[PDB]
Short mmCIF file of C-alpha atoms in Angstrom, two decimals:
data_model
loop_
_atom_site.label_atom_id
_atom_site.label_comp_id
_atom_site.label_asym_id
_atom_site.label_seq_id
_atom_site.Cartn_x
_atom_site.Cartn_y
_atom_site.Cartn_z
CA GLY A 41 172.75 73.46 -170.13
CA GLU A 42 175.57 75.08 -168.12
CA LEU A 43 174.10 73.58 -164.92
CA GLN A 44 175.72 70.28 -165.95
CA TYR A 45 179.19 71.76 -165.99
CA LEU A 46 178.50 73.39 -162.58
CA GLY A 47 177.11 70.16 -161.15
CA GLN A 48 180.20 68.27 -162.36
CA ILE A 49 182.56 70.81 -160.79
CA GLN A 50 180.62 70.60 -157.56
CA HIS A 51 180.79 66.75 -157.72
CA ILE A 52 184.55 66.72 -158.10
CA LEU A 53 184.95 69.23 -155.19
CA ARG A 54 182.82 66.95 -153.02
CA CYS A 55 184.09 63.48 -154.15
CA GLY A 56 187.28 63.85 -156.15
CA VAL A 57 190.31 62.02 -154.89
CA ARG A 58 193.59 63.74 -154.53
CA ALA A 59 195.89 62.59 -157.40
CA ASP A 60 198.99 64.15 -158.90
CA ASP A 61 199.44 64.79 -162.64
CA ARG A 62 202.71 63.83 -164.47
CA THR A 63 204.43 67.05 -163.26
CA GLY A 64 203.45 66.44 -159.60
CA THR A 65 200.90 69.26 -159.36
CA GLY A 66 198.00 68.32 -157.10
CA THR A 67 194.49 67.73 -158.51
CA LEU A 68 191.18 66.34 -157.43
CA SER A 69 190.03 63.62 -159.96
CA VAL A 70 187.04 61.41 -160.75
CA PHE A 71 186.59 59.00 -163.65
CA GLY A 72 183.76 59.01 -166.30
CA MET A 73 181.63 62.09 -166.98
CA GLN A 74 179.36 63.24 -169.78
CA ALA A 75 177.34 66.30 -170.56
CA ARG A 76 175.11 67.31 -173.51
CA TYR A 77 174.80 70.93 -174.86
CA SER A 78 172.11 71.84 -177.29
CA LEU A 79 173.39 73.61 -180.45
CA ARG A 80 169.82 74.31 -181.73
CA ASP A 81 169.35 78.09 -182.03
CA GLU A 82 171.94 78.58 -179.31
CA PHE A 83 175.70 78.23 -178.75
CA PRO A 84 177.27 76.89 -175.55
CA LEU A 85 179.82 79.57 -174.71
CA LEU A 86 179.68 79.35 -170.88
CA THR A 87 178.32 82.44 -168.98
CA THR A 88 179.43 81.89 -165.38
CA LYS A 89 182.85 83.32 -166.44
CA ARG A 90 183.81 85.09 -169.69
CA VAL A 91 185.31 82.45 -172.01
CA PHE A 92 188.03 83.69 -174.40
CA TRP A 93 185.90 83.34 -177.58
CA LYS A 94 188.58 85.03 -179.75
CA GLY A 95 191.19 82.48 -178.67
CA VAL A 96 188.59 79.64 -179.34
CA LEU A 97 187.81 80.85 -182.81
CA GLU A 98 191.44 81.73 -183.87
CA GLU A 99 192.91 78.54 -182.47
CA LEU A 100 190.26 76.35 -184.27
CA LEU A 101 190.88 78.11 -187.59
CA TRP A 102 194.60 77.50 -187.02
CA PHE A 103 193.99 73.73 -186.37
CA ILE A 104 191.93 73.65 -189.60
CA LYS A 105 194.86 75.18 -191.54
CA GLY A 106 196.96 72.20 -190.32
CA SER A 107 199.64 74.75 -189.12
CA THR A 108 202.50 73.70 -186.89
CA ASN A 109 203.71 77.32 -186.54
CA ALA A 110 203.03 78.93 -183.18
CA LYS A 111 203.76 82.33 -184.75
CA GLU A 112 200.75 81.98 -187.09
CA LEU A 113 198.45 81.85 -184.06
CA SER A 114 200.08 84.29 -181.54
CA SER A 115 200.14 87.05 -184.17
CA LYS A 116 196.32 86.87 -184.15
CA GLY A 117 196.35 88.39 -180.66
CA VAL A 118 196.07 85.00 -178.95
CA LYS A 119 198.46 83.22 -176.54
CA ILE A 120 196.99 79.77 -175.66
CA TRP A 121 199.69 77.52 -177.31
CA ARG A 138 214.64 72.37 -183.19
CA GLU A 139 213.70 75.91 -184.40
CA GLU A 140 211.54 78.77 -183.06
CA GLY A 141 207.73 78.43 -183.21
CA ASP A 142 207.89 74.90 -184.67
CA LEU A 143 205.47 72.87 -182.53
CA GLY A 144 205.88 69.53 -184.25
CA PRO A 145 202.89 67.40 -185.38
CA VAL A 146 200.26 69.12 -183.26
CA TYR A 147 196.48 68.36 -183.36
CA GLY A 148 195.77 70.29 -186.50
CA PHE A 149 198.56 68.66 -188.50
CA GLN A 150 197.04 65.29 -187.41
CA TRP A 151 193.59 66.37 -188.45
CA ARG A 152 194.77 67.19 -192.00
CA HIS A 153 197.83 64.88 -192.50
CA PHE A 154 197.15 61.86 -190.26
CA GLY A 155 200.03 59.39 -190.49
CA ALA A 156 202.43 61.56 -192.57
CA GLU A 157 206.00 61.72 -191.30
CA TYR A 158 206.62 65.13 -189.76
CA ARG A 159 209.74 67.01 -190.94
CA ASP A 160 209.51 70.84 -190.91
CA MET A 161 207.01 73.63 -190.07
CA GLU A 162 207.65 75.16 -193.56
CA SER A 163 207.48 71.89 -195.49
CA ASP A 164 204.87 71.03 -198.16
CA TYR A 165 202.58 68.26 -196.82
CA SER A 166 200.23 68.45 -199.81
CA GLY A 167 198.45 65.15 -200.36
CA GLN A 168 200.44 63.44 -197.55
CA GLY A 169 198.61 61.50 -194.80
CA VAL A 170 194.90 61.11 -194.30
CA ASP A 171 192.86 64.28 -194.28
CA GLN A 172 190.60 63.08 -191.43
CA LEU A 173 188.67 66.31 -191.37
CA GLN A 174 187.81 66.29 -195.09
CA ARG A 175 187.02 62.60 -194.77
CA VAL A 176 184.50 63.30 -192.04
CA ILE A 177 182.86 65.97 -194.21
CA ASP A 178 182.94 63.65 -197.33
CA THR A 179 181.37 60.80 -195.33
CA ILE A 180 178.55 62.98 -194.00
CA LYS A 181 177.80 63.95 -197.69
CA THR A 182 178.02 60.39 -199.04
CA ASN A 183 176.43 58.48 -196.21
CA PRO A 184 175.03 60.51 -193.29
CA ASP A 185 173.84 57.23 -191.64
CA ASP A 186 177.37 55.91 -191.35
CA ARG A 187 178.25 55.44 -187.60
CA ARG A 188 182.01 55.40 -188.27
CA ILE A 189 182.27 59.16 -188.78
CA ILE A 190 185.20 59.65 -186.36
CA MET A 191 188.35 61.74 -186.28
CA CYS A 192 191.16 61.20 -183.58
CA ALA A 193 194.10 63.22 -182.19
CA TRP A 194 197.23 62.13 -180.23
CA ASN A 195 199.35 64.03 -177.74
CA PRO A 196 202.63 64.45 -179.79
CA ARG A 197 204.63 63.50 -176.73
CA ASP A 198 203.14 59.96 -176.95
CA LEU A 199 204.13 59.32 -180.58
CA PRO A 200 207.77 58.26 -180.16
CA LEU A 201 206.87 56.66 -176.81
CA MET A 202 205.76 53.21 -177.81
CA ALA A 203 204.36 51.45 -180.82
CA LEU A 204 200.71 52.19 -181.62
CA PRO A 205 200.15 54.56 -178.72
CA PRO A 206 196.57 55.38 -177.83
CA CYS A 207 194.81 58.59 -178.87
CA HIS A 208 194.22 61.40 -176.58
CA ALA A 209 190.78 62.44 -177.96
CA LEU A 210 188.27 61.40 -180.59
CA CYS A 211 185.23 63.16 -182.11
CA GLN A 212 182.33 61.03 -183.48
CA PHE A 213 179.80 62.75 -185.65
CA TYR A 214 176.18 61.73 -186.08
CA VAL A 215 173.34 62.76 -188.41
CA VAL A 216 169.67 62.33 -187.98
CA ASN A 217 166.81 64.38 -189.56
CA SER A 218 169.25 66.80 -191.24
CA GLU A 219 170.94 67.62 -187.89
CA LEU A 220 174.60 67.06 -187.12
CA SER A 221 175.72 66.11 -183.58
CA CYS A 222 179.29 65.58 -182.25
CA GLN A 223 180.54 63.63 -179.26
CA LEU A 224 184.03 64.53 -178.10
CA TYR A 225 185.61 61.81 -175.90
CA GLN A 226 188.89 62.92 -174.17
CA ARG A 227 190.88 60.51 -171.97
CA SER A 228 191.75 63.30 -169.50
CA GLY A 229 190.12 66.79 -169.14
CA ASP A 230 191.09 69.80 -167.05
CA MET A 231 187.64 70.85 -165.78
CA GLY A 232 188.69 74.35 -164.72
CA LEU A 233 190.47 75.82 -167.73
CA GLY A 234 190.35 73.27 -170.56
CA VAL A 235 186.69 72.04 -170.57
CA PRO A 236 184.79 75.40 -171.02
CA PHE A 237 187.21 76.31 -173.83
CA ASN A 238 186.76 72.88 -175.54
CA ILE A 239 183.04 72.93 -175.24
CA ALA A 240 183.14 76.11 -177.21
CA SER A 241 185.81 74.91 -179.74
CA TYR A 242 184.02 71.62 -180.64
CA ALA A 243 180.69 73.19 -180.64
CA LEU A 244 182.08 75.70 -183.16
CA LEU A 245 183.63 72.88 -185.22
CA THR A 246 180.18 71.23 -185.33
CA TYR A 247 178.56 74.52 -186.57
CA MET A 248 181.27 74.79 -189.31
CA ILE A 249 180.81 71.22 -190.58
CA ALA A 250 177.04 71.47 -190.38
CA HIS A 251 177.25 74.71 -192.44
CA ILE A 252 179.55 73.05 -195.06
CA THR A 253 177.27 69.98 -195.37
CA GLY A 254 173.92 71.83 -195.36
CA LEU A 255 172.75 70.39 -191.98
CA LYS A 256 171.58 72.14 -188.83
CA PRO A 257 173.66 71.66 -185.62
CA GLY A 258 172.01 69.25 -183.11
CA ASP A 259 173.94 68.40 -179.86
CA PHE A 260 177.51 68.52 -178.67
CA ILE A 261 178.19 65.78 -176.16
CA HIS A 262 181.36 65.92 -174.11
CA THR A 263 182.56 62.71 -172.45
CA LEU A 264 185.65 62.49 -170.20
CA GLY A 265 187.74 59.63 -168.82
CA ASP A 266 189.80 61.27 -166.02
CA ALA A 267 188.09 64.57 -165.16
CA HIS A 268 190.24 66.70 -162.78
CA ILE A 269 190.46 70.04 -161.12
CA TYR A 270 193.86 71.56 -160.18
CA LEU A 271 194.23 72.35 -156.46
CA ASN A 272 195.08 75.98 -157.17
CA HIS A 273 191.76 76.30 -159.13
CA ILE A 274 189.55 75.16 -156.30
CA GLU A 275 188.96 78.58 -154.63
CA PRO A 276 188.11 80.34 -157.89
CA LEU A 277 185.76 77.48 -158.97
CA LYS A 278 183.96 77.63 -155.56
CA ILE A 279 183.19 81.24 -156.37
CA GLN A 280 182.24 80.56 -159.97
CA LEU A 281 179.75 78.01 -158.50
CA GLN A 282 177.82 80.83 -156.73
CA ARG A 283 177.11 82.56 -160.02
CA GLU A 284 173.76 82.17 -161.85
CA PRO A 285 174.09 81.07 -165.45
CA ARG A 286 172.59 83.43 -168.00
CA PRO A 287 170.93 82.24 -171.26
CA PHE A 288 173.46 81.15 -173.82
CA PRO A 289 174.26 83.40 -176.85
CA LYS A 290 173.82 82.55 -180.49
CA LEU A 291 176.45 82.03 -183.14
CA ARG A 292 175.76 83.46 -186.57
CA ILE A 293 177.65 82.48 -189.64
CA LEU A 294 177.73 85.61 -191.87
CA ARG A 295 178.01 84.23 -195.42
CA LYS A 296 177.68 81.12 -197.44
CA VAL A 297 180.92 79.17 -197.20
CA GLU A 298 181.46 76.03 -199.23
CA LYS A 299 184.83 74.51 -198.18
CA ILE A 300 186.01 74.10 -194.50
CA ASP A 301 189.38 75.77 -195.46
CA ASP A 302 187.52 78.91 -196.67
CA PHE A 303 186.21 80.08 -193.24
CA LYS A 304 187.72 83.20 -191.75
CA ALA A 305 187.32 84.74 -188.34
CA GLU A 306 185.16 87.51 -189.88
CA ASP A 307 182.54 84.97 -190.91
CA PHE A 308 181.32 84.47 -187.36
CA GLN A 309 179.48 86.64 -184.90
CA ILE A 310 178.48 85.71 -181.39
CA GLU A 311 175.17 87.46 -180.40
CA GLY A 312 173.72 88.10 -176.99
CA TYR A 313 176.71 86.94 -174.96
CA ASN A 314 176.43 88.30 -171.42
CA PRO A 315 178.89 86.47 -169.13
CA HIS A 316 179.91 87.07 -165.55
CA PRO A 317 183.50 88.39 -165.21
CA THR A 318 186.69 86.68 -166.36
CA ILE A 319 188.13 84.24 -163.88
CA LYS A 320 191.91 83.80 -163.87
CA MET A 321 193.11 80.26 -163.34
CA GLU A 322 196.88 79.66 -162.83
CA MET A 323 198.43 77.84 -165.84
CA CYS B 1 195.55 52.51 -180.81
CA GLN B 2 197.86 53.65 -182.70
CA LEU B 3 201.07 55.50 -183.90
CA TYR B 4 199.09 58.30 -185.61
CA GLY C 41 172.35 50.52 -160.90
CA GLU C 42 170.12 48.70 -163.40
CA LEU C 43 167.64 51.61 -163.26
CA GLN C 44 170.01 53.48 -165.60
CA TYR C 45 169.77 50.85 -168.29
CA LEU C 46 165.94 50.83 -167.88
CA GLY C 47 165.77 54.63 -167.99
CA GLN C 48 167.87 54.66 -171.17
CA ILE C 49 165.64 52.06 -172.86
CA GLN C 50 162.60 54.06 -171.87
CA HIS C 51 164.26 57.25 -173.26
CA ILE C 52 164.94 55.70 -176.63
CA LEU C 53 161.33 54.34 -176.83
CA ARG C 54 160.04 57.84 -176.11
CA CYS C 55 162.54 59.96 -178.16
CA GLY C 56 164.49 57.75 -180.52
CA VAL C 57 164.31 58.56 -184.18
CA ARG C 58 163.59 55.93 -186.71
CA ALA C 59 166.86 55.08 -188.56
CA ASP C 60 167.90 52.04 -190.55
CA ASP C 61 171.13 50.08 -189.91
CA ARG C 62 173.45 49.04 -192.81
CA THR C 63 171.24 46.00 -193.61
CA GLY C 64 168.03 48.10 -193.73
CA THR C 65 166.50 46.75 -190.51
CA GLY C 66 164.54 49.42 -188.67
CA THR C 67 165.77 50.83 -185.33
CA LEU C 68 165.03 53.67 -183.00
CA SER C 69 168.31 55.63 -182.27
CA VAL C 70 169.64 58.43 -180.06
CA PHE C 71 173.20 59.73 -179.79
CA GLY C 72 175.38 59.95 -176.60
CA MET C 73 174.64 57.90 -173.48
CA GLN C 74 176.57 56.87 -170.39
CA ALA C 75 175.92 54.77 -167.36
CA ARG C 76 178.04 53.80 -164.32
CA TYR C 77 177.85 50.35 -162.55
CA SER C 78 179.50 49.82 -159.23
CA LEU C 79 181.82 46.76 -159.12
CA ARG C 80 182.42 47.12 -155.33
CA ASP C 81 181.18 43.95 -153.59
CA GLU C 82 178.72 43.42 -156.41
CA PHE C 83 178.66 42.45 -160.10
CA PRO C 84 176.38 44.04 -162.70
CA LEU C 85 174.78 41.02 -164.35
CA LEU C 86 171.34 42.52 -165.15
CA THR C 87 168.28 41.01 -163.31
CA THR C 88 165.29 42.23 -165.32
CA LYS C 89 166.00 39.33 -167.76
CA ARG C 90 168.37 36.36 -167.32
CA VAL C 91 171.66 37.29 -169.05
CA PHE C 92 173.60 34.38 -170.60
CA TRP C 93 176.47 34.47 -168.05
CA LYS C 94 178.04 31.25 -169.47
CA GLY C 95 178.25 32.80 -172.94
CA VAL C 96 179.75 36.03 -171.33
CA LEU C 97 182.40 34.15 -169.45
CA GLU C 98 183.34 31.64 -172.25
CA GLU C 99 183.42 34.27 -174.96
CA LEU C 100 185.70 36.59 -172.85
CA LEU C 101 188.12 33.75 -172.09
CA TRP C 102 188.15 33.01 -175.83
CA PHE C 103 188.96 36.71 -176.65
CA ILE C 104 191.77 36.52 -174.07
CA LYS C 105 193.21 33.43 -175.82
CA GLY C 106 193.43 35.58 -179.00
CA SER C 107 191.57 32.74 -180.88
CA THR C 108 190.17 33.26 -184.36
CA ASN C 109 188.55 29.79 -184.36
CA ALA C 110 184.78 29.77 -183.96
CA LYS C 111 184.97 26.05 -183.15
CA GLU C 112 186.99 26.75 -179.99
CA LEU C 113 184.07 28.75 -178.60
CA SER C 114 180.94 26.85 -179.86
CA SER C 115 182.29 23.58 -178.41
CA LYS C 116 182.02 25.22 -174.97
CA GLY C 117 178.23 25.04 -175.29
CA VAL C 118 177.95 28.64 -176.53
CA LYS C 119 176.63 30.03 -179.85
CA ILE C 120 177.04 33.87 -179.83
CA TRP C 121 179.66 34.21 -182.68
CA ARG C 138 188.33 30.91 -196.76
CA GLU C 139 187.98 27.82 -194.47
CA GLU C 140 185.46 26.65 -191.85
CA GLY C 141 185.40 28.36 -188.43
CA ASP C 142 188.13 30.87 -189.41
CA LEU C 143 186.75 34.26 -188.33
CA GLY C 144 189.66 36.40 -189.42
CA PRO C 145 191.27 39.03 -187.12
CA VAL C 146 188.43 39.27 -184.61
CA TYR C 147 188.49 41.35 -181.38
CA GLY C 148 190.56 38.94 -179.39
CA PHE C 149 193.27 38.60 -182.03
CA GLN C 150 193.45 42.45 -181.99
CA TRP C 151 193.70 42.52 -178.24
CA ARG C 152 196.73 40.19 -178.26
CA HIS C 153 198.35 40.83 -181.71
CA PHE C 154 197.40 44.43 -182.59
CA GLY C 155 198.83 45.36 -185.98
CA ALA C 156 200.09 41.88 -187.00
CA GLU C 157 199.17 40.77 -190.51
CA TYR C 158 196.49 38.10 -190.31
CA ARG C 159 197.10 34.88 -192.29
CA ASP C 160 195.57 31.68 -190.82
CA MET C 161 193.50 30.52 -187.80
CA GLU C 162 196.16 27.82 -187.11
CA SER C 163 199.19 30.07 -187.59
CA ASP C 164 201.75 30.94 -184.88
CA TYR C 165 201.40 34.66 -183.99
CA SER C 166 203.87 34.43 -181.10
CA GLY C 167 205.50 37.78 -180.43
CA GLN C 168 203.76 39.39 -183.45
CA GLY C 169 201.84 42.68 -183.02
CA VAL C 170 201.21 44.62 -179.86
CA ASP C 171 199.79 42.69 -176.94
CA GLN C 172 197.45 45.54 -175.91
CA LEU C 173 195.98 43.53 -173.09
CA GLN C 174 199.32 42.66 -171.48
CA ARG C 175 200.40 46.25 -172.03
CA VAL C 176 197.40 47.52 -170.10
CA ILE C 177 198.22 45.14 -167.23
CA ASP C 178 201.99 46.09 -167.37
CA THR C 179 201.13 49.81 -167.31
CA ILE C 180 198.82 49.46 -164.30
CA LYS C 181 201.77 47.71 -162.47
CA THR C 182 204.41 50.24 -163.54
CA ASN C 183 202.42 53.43 -163.34
CA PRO C 184 198.83 53.19 -162.05
CA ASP C 185 198.48 57.01 -162.40
CA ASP C 186 199.03 56.88 -166.14
CA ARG C 187 195.85 58.17 -167.94
CA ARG C 188 196.81 56.52 -171.26
CA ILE C 189 195.83 53.02 -170.14
CA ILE C 190 193.67 52.25 -173.22
CA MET C 191 193.05 49.25 -175.44
CA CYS C 192 191.02 49.52 -178.80
CA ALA C 193 189.21 47.09 -181.14
CA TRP C 194 188.11 47.46 -184.81
CA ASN C 195 185.26 45.81 -186.70
CA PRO C 196 187.26 43.51 -189.10
CA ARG C 197 185.00 44.56 -191.93
CA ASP C 198 186.45 48.11 -191.69
CA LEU C 199 190.10 47.08 -191.99
CA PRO C 200 190.44 46.72 -195.77
CA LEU C 201 187.91 49.55 -196.22
CA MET C 202 190.07 52.62 -196.11
CA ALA C 203 193.40 53.69 -194.73
CA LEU C 204 193.54 54.21 -190.96
CA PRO C 205 189.90 53.34 -190.32
CA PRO C 206 188.47 54.31 -186.96
CA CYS C 207 188.03 51.90 -184.06
CA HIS C 208 184.79 50.45 -183.11
CA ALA C 209 185.35 50.44 -179.30
CA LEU C 210 187.96 51.45 -176.75
CA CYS C 211 188.40 50.61 -173.04
CA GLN C 212 190.25 53.12 -170.78
CA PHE C 213 191.35 51.91 -167.40
CA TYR C 214 191.84 54.05 -164.32
CA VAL C 215 193.33 53.51 -160.85
CA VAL C 216 192.79 55.44 -157.72
CA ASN C 217 193.20 54.27 -154.07
CA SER C 218 194.02 50.69 -155.14
CA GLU C 219 190.76 50.43 -157.17
CA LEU C 220 190.58 49.74 -160.88
CA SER C 221 187.80 51.28 -163.02
CA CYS C 222 187.09 50.79 -166.76
CA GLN C 223 185.21 52.97 -169.22
CA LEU C 224 184.10 51.22 -172.39
CA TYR C 225 183.26 53.67 -175.22
CA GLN C 226 181.53 52.01 -178.27
CA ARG C 227 180.61 54.03 -181.37
CA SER C 228 177.34 52.10 -181.81
CA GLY C 229 175.51 49.85 -179.25
CA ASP C 230 172.51 47.57 -179.62
CA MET C 231 170.65 48.42 -176.39
CA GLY C 232 168.40 45.35 -176.44
CA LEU C 233 170.74 42.41 -176.92
CA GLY C 234 174.32 43.71 -177.00
CA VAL C 235 174.50 46.19 -174.05
CA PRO C 236 173.45 43.89 -171.11
CA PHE C 237 175.87 41.24 -172.39
CA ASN C 238 178.74 43.81 -172.73
CA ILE C 239 178.12 45.31 -169.36
CA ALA C 240 178.71 41.88 -167.97
CA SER C 241 181.72 41.05 -170.25
CA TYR C 242 183.67 44.28 -169.49
CA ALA C 243 182.78 44.22 -165.91
CA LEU C 244 184.23 40.70 -165.80
CA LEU C 245 187.35 41.85 -167.69
CA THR C 246 187.80 44.57 -165.03
CA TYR C 247 187.52 41.97 -162.19
CA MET C 248 190.16 39.77 -163.97
CA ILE C 249 192.67 42.61 -164.44
CA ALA C 250 192.07 43.92 -160.95
CA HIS C 251 192.72 40.38 -159.62
CA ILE C 252 195.96 40.05 -161.68
CA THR C 253 197.25 43.48 -160.53
CA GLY C 254 196.24 43.19 -156.85
CA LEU C 255 193.60 46.00 -157.00
CA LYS C 256 189.92 45.98 -156.06
CA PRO C 257 187.34 46.64 -158.85
CA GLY C 258 185.84 50.18 -158.69
CA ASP C 259 183.35 51.23 -161.47
CA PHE C 260 182.52 50.13 -164.97
CA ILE C 261 181.33 53.05 -167.06
CA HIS C 262 179.67 52.37 -170.38
CA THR C 263 179.50 55.21 -172.90
CA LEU C 264 177.78 54.94 -176.32
CA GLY C 265 177.80 57.04 -179.48
CA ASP C 266 174.77 55.75 -181.46
CA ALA C 267 172.55 53.85 -179.01
CA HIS C 268 169.73 51.97 -180.81
CA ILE C 269 166.93 49.55 -180.28
CA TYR C 270 165.76 47.23 -183.12
CA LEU C 271 162.08 47.63 -184.03
CA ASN C 272 161.39 43.94 -183.46
CA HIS C 273 162.77 44.31 -179.87
CA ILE C 274 160.43 47.08 -178.85
CA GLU C 275 157.53 44.91 -177.56
CA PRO C 276 159.76 42.66 -175.47
CA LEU C 277 161.66 45.67 -174.02
CA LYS C 278 158.32 47.37 -173.08
CA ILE C 279 157.60 44.29 -171.00
CA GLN C 280 161.08 44.06 -169.55
CA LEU C 281 160.51 47.72 -168.43
CA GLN C 282 157.62 46.62 -166.13
CA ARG C 283 159.91 44.32 -164.17
CA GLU C 284 161.46 45.36 -160.82
CA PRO C 285 165.22 44.99 -160.67
CA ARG C 286 166.51 42.70 -157.95
CA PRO C 287 169.82 43.30 -156.09
CA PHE C 288 172.82 42.41 -158.20
CA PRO C 289 174.79 39.18 -157.51
CA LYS C 290 178.42 38.88 -156.57
CA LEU C 291 181.28 37.44 -158.55
CA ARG C 292 183.81 35.35 -156.68
CA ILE C 293 187.17 34.45 -158.06
CA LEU C 294 188.01 30.99 -156.60
CA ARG C 295 191.82 30.91 -156.52
CA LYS C 296 194.86 33.05 -156.78
CA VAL C 297 195.67 33.55 -160.44
CA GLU C 298 198.80 35.38 -161.52
CA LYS C 299 198.71 35.73 -165.35
CA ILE C 300 195.60 36.82 -167.39
CA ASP C 301 196.12 33.76 -169.71
CA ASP C 302 195.85 31.38 -166.70
CA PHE C 303 192.14 32.01 -165.89
CA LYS C 304 189.69 29.23 -166.59
CA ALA C 305 185.92 29.17 -166.48
CA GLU C 306 186.07 27.12 -163.24
CA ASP C 307 187.79 29.99 -161.44
CA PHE C 308 184.62 32.06 -161.28
CA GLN C 309 181.36 31.71 -159.43
CA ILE C 310 178.41 34.05 -159.60
CA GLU C 311 176.55 34.16 -156.21
CA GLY C 312 173.04 35.29 -155.44
CA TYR C 313 171.89 35.80 -159.02
CA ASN C 314 168.09 35.90 -159.10
CA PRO C 315 166.90 37.27 -162.48
CA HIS C 316 163.47 37.54 -164.02
CA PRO C 317 162.96 35.11 -166.95
CA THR C 318 164.95 34.97 -170.19
CA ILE C 319 163.75 37.33 -172.87
CA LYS C 320 164.22 36.24 -176.49
CA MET C 321 165.21 38.99 -178.86
CA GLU C 322 165.31 38.21 -182.63
CA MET C 323 168.91 38.19 -183.98
CA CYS D 1 192.23 56.20 -186.30
CA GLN D 2 193.72 53.70 -187.62
CA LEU D 3 194.38 50.47 -189.68
CA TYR D 4 194.68 48.27 -186.57
#
């Protein structure tokens, strides 16, 4: 459960090596981590600090839309994320239009590129034993950088006994701010796809290459480490939904969430 | 691995 | 150390779910595993059964060559792997000529495609902090299958304090026959690149999506589980080598390897 | 993720 995340933070505090990110900002870093969160009658929204579940849910729905318009997200009461609001081919555009040439935020990308997300759902329905059920996302800043740049993250899905699991592998993870939010966002993506395909959620596994903590996050994380996890909440899906594009924020209700207080981490 |  | 591999095998024997591979052959399978092998003054050639180190070394040198000729490997006294011996764009061709159109085993691919392997080495020398140091390989059978198929495996390299680590992520791993051999092959690739770039080897991390054991391997693996690991050997590199293409089998010597006997596993 |  959440003790894995806390054990990992503790491990980086104890053994991480000082290393600077591309902007020069100090971090402590280790290489190679993995944790596994059960999705079975529970939902891994971490409880040692209040995670911004509304941001998680609204940003994932916005990825699913394939939107490249920052306005379409901020107006939902959420901050998180050459004209105004145009973000270029961000993660959601790649999920729905993989390989299409990006032009405009208000363009019509209908039937352009590979719809990786629909493909994952179609493969689970046509062959749930397939072990190539994988979707990938690139940091847009890498795309013009070199030929055939590598991906930044990949999700592999897996089905056994009518249960759907997901392993997210990211090449670099911010353990303080980004990981608890991503645990929740990919766990929620797994619940959505399992709902669509008639499966029950199984496990979300999160695997990192470089796992780092920003120097300015160390003192808050030391304090978060003294807090006792509470039992995870549940996620209910409130109606039958048939197509991944048809979900709305109102379809979801988190139950029994009882976190310790919000922790601010400098962005 | 490669140009999306 | 090797107790991780043994604990993983035991875990699959105890909790793996029966699942058939694409040929129908029974396996036991779990999803999401990871292990970490130190490369620091030791080399993880497993000792609870004799691993075919000559096959490991000769096949890796053959990948590095970018060869698509089965003859060029078998003639080395090694079996492991529309004319005779032409294997098509196998893993090594992808490592050295990523994205080039494959024609013939005796063609001249000079300067065609991305040399992912050289790129990894060039990136370690120009920016060892980069966390995009990643090379990827596809099962050739997937290439004509669909547009933009997913990769079968990826290696991410990492440098801290003059030490080079590698994390291999494979979407599916055969725990009985393929994993001990791959631990050795990617560990050896990490020693070669660390030699070339003037770094010391750090850790090899091996992460799996679907991790499975073939039904016909269960009885031998139960017996391998009763065997006590011995201390790992060392790998010596016998001369100064400057370019990854310049290594030869004679440059390497395994020292202090003292395995339990060979275990045959049905292919 | 994609055609090598």
